[PDB]
Design an enzyme around this catalytic site. Structure first.
Site, short mmCIF file in Angstrom:
data_model
loop_
_atom_site.label_atom_id
_atom_site.label_comp_id
_atom_site.label_asym_id
_atom_site.label_seq_id
_atom_site.Cartn_x
_atom_site.Cartn_y
_atom_site.Cartn_z
N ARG B 62 46.10 53.95 37.89
CA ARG B 62 45.95 52.75 38.71
C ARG B 62 47.29 52.30 39.28
O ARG B 62 47.40 52.06 40.48
CB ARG B 62 45.29 51.63 37.90
CG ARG B 62 43.92 51.17 38.41
CD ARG B 62 43.33 50.17 37.43
NE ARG B 62 44.44 49.68 36.61
CZ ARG B 62 44.90 48.43 36.60
NH1 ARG B 62 44.14 47.44 37.04
NH2 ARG B 62 46.10 48.19 36.10
N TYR B 66 48.06 51.46 43.19
CA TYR B 66 48.54 50.16 43.63
C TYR B 66 49.89 50.32 44.32
O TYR B 66 50.13 49.71 45.36
CB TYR B 66 48.63 49.20 42.44
CG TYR B 66 47.30 48.86 41.79
CD1 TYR B 66 46.10 49.13 42.43
CD2 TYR B 66 47.25 48.25 40.54
CE1 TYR B 66 44.88 48.82 41.84
CE2 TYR B 66 46.04 47.93 39.94
CZ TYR B 66 44.85 48.22 40.59
OH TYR B 66 43.66 47.91 40.00
N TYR B 88 38.95 40.24 47.96
CA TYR B 88 37.70 39.67 47.50
C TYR B 88 38.01 38.44 46.64
O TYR B 88 39.02 38.40 45.95
CB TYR B 88 36.92 40.72 46.71
CG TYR B 88 35.46 40.36 46.44
CD1 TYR B 88 34.62 39.93 47.46
CD2 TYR B 88 34.93 40.44 45.16
CE1 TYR B 88 33.30 39.60 47.22
CE2 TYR B 88 33.61 40.11 44.90
CZ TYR B 88 32.79 39.69 45.93
OH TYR B 88 31.49 39.36 45.69
N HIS B 90 39.29 35.18 45.18
CA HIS B 90 40.58 34.52 45.32
C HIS B 90 41.67 35.60 45.26
O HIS B 90 41.69 36.41 44.34
CB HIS B 90 40.74 33.43 44.26
CG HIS B 90 42.00 32.64 44.35
ND1 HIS B 90 43.24 33.21 44.56
CD2 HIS B 90 42.21 31.33 44.23
CE1 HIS B 90 44.16 32.25 44.58
NE2 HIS B 90 43.56 31.10 44.38
N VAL B 93 43.54 35.66 41.77
CA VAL B 93 42.82 35.79 40.51
C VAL B 93 42.38 37.24 40.34
O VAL B 93 41.58 37.74 41.13
CB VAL B 93 41.62 34.82 40.45
CG1 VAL B 93 40.82 34.98 39.16
CG2 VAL B 93 42.05 33.37 40.64
N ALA B 120 35.16 33.68 41.36
CA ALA B 120 33.88 33.80 40.67
C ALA B 120 33.65 32.55 39.81
O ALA B 120 32.51 32.14 39.60
CB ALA B 120 33.85 35.06 39.84
N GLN B 162 35.81 40.09 32.17
CA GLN B 162 35.89 41.53 32.01
C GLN B 162 35.35 41.91 30.64
O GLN B 162 36.01 42.60 29.86
CB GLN B 162 37.33 42.00 32.22
CG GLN B 162 37.86 41.71 33.62
CD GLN B 162 39.23 42.31 33.89
OE1 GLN B 162 39.90 42.82 32.98
NE2 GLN B 162 39.66 42.25 35.14
N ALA B 203 28.55 36.78 40.33
CA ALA B 203 28.41 36.17 41.64
C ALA B 203 27.80 37.17 42.62
O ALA B 203 28.05 38.37 42.53
CB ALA B 203 29.75 35.68 42.13
N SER B 230 31.09 41.41 35.55
CA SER B 230 30.36 40.56 34.62
C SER B 230 31.33 39.66 33.85
O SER B 230 32.44 40.08 33.51
CB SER B 230 29.52 41.38 33.67
OG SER B 230 28.59 42.19 34.38
N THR B 231 30.89 38.43 33.59
CA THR B 231 31.66 37.47 32.81
C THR B 231 30.74 36.81 31.79
O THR B 231 29.55 36.64 32.04
CB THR B 231 32.28 36.43 33.75
OG1 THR B 231 33.22 37.15 34.55
CG2 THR B 231 32.98 35.31 33.00
#
Ligand code: ZN
Lengths: 52, 257, 252, 51
Positions: B62, B66, B88, B90, B93, B120, B162, B203, B230-231
């Site tokens: 990753r 990045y 996507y 904010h 965040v 979210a 997460q 969301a 998912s949260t």
């Protein structure tokens, strides 16, 4: 076509309200196929990415 | 030129700042990192000069992807282009790329800012109709809540983010998601009964799509099917109790406030 | 009739979602509750039919006349839209009350998310809460109730300006209230601990306030309605050996 | 004055042009030096009258 609709629906409050009143008619007035309307109405998101 | 990162929120088209939208319209170039293709088209029509950053992904670590993503953005800034990054939710965040791009942009002395957007969390409150200022609010990254000591206040709403990759480590792979989750359940059981009702939230992206709001006992959590976005929401387990001590000083009682 | 509560954000004009703005345009009537008059004028040019609720004595009775007025419109069958400051579901009673009572009268009522002061704080202070984690409490509530903060993660206290807002019985200045808070936070944070007094910019020509000071100088500080106190961590993280052991990681 | 803050808060173009040449852009809409001063000084309160 279908993309122009979702885009409008997401940003126009009027159209948004109308949709939640009469989903089908509203979609028909924006020229969606019967299959699209179905996929949307059954919430089959895989078949919308098929019909794009 | 300049760098400005903007958030599109969660919903397509309509859940973005009027100003942020303006930035995307009056920008020389726009680097995007959005979920679906409906969102990608929306952006295109809004500004034809768009570079999709999904392409920098895979086999590659990753921090490598990045590195490239960020460099590509600075390449435009260095070139003198009024650059705008469209992220996507904010743009700050859960967004390593924005902070990296902004930090590095500022380093080289380029004018760079970040415009706030709807996260979210912002949606979670409206969707569920919960006011965080009601009983308070605590947010943690699941893994971080499992790896480190974080004693939650069970009079507040507790958000574990997460939750899908909760406990994910190179040395934990021998465990299944169900297992790690079970371990998290055993941990939360310290403050929350197994019967306590918890909520998994996701969301919506599309206007014809609904937010996932699955209510279930904490105990059935291991079985639940989770998604990257998912949260977990664990509502209070105890009602707030007065600080009779502090109420004493001000010389009032519970009935005076 | 129907009710939809939207948020304008902190900035003027520019910090409202495209959709939320559309709701205001297509609303038969709008009920405003914004701070400055620049925001008030803007709204009007966005929809002529606007009823300012500041026109509406305990906060109990003030909001009761507000909500009542909003409903009247919804009961008359007018598509009502209530525009509030920032986020309409964050430290906002009028909305939750109105929505609740509209749901109770069979009317359709919902709430659109907007940008809260917190969303602004993250951007202005270049902080990612996702990785760091955070906590939020209403200053007053944090004083009158038992809230155990985790001093390893950021702690936000909203409405720090009116902290200790209660019915008069004894004579205390705001500085006296803030002094009590300082003492209460001292159970976790030292007096010399640096904190931040954040105030989101309203006007595009104004910059946000980001004052840093030791927790001991909070009482003296000059605060504002929208002022929020950020208390960065004061304790180091520790391995959760218990849970690490379960996961498979121990002494390593 | 009010229209300007509104355009400045919505329009990303006017936003940038403003930072390019604050004073000049404020003239382009039509604000007096007294206002421009209050804007440039930093006296928000000042703007409680030019409004
Ligand atoms: Zn929060």
């Amino acid at each position: 076509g279908l993309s122009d609709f979702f885009t409008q629906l997401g940003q126009d409050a009027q159209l948004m309200e109308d949709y939640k009143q009469n989903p089908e008619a509203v979609m028909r007035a924006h020229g969606l196929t019967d299959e699209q309307i179905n996929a949307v109405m059954t919430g089959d998101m895989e078949k919308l990415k098929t019909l794009s | 030129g300049s760098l400005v990162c903007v958030g599109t929120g969660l919903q397509l088209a309509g859940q973005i700042s009027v100003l942020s939208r303006s930035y995307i319209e009056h920008a020389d170039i726009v680097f995007s990192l959005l979920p679906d293709g409906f969102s990608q088209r929306w952006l295109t029509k809004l500004n034809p000069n768009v570079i999709n950053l999904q392409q920098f992904y895979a086999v590659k670590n990753r921090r490598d992807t990045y590195e490239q993503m960020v460099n590509a953005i600075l390449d435009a800034v260095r070139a003198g282009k009024k650059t705008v990054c469209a992220l996507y939710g904010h743009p700050g965040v859960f967004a390593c790329v924005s902070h990296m791009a902004i930090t590095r942009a500022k380093a080289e002395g380029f004018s760079a800012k970040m415009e706030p957007g709807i996260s979210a969390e912002a949606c979670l409150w409206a969707d569920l109709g919960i006011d965080p200022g009601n009983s308070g609010h605590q947010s943690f990254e699941a893994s971080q809540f499992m790896f480190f000591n974080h004693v939650p206040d069970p009079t507040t709403h507790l958000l574990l983010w997460q939750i899908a990759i909760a406990g994910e480590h190179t040395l934990t792979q021998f465990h299944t998601s169900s297992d790690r989750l079970q371990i998290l359940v055993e941990q939360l059981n310290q403050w929350y009964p197994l019967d306590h009702e918890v909520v998994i939230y996701e969301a919506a992206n599309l206007p014809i799509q609904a937010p996932r709001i699955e209510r279930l006992p904490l105990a059935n959590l291991p079985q639940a099917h989770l998604m990257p976005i998912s949260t977990l929401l664990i509502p209070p387990a105890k009602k707030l109790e007065y600080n009779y001590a502090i109420l004493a000083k001000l010389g009032i009682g519970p009935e005076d406030l």
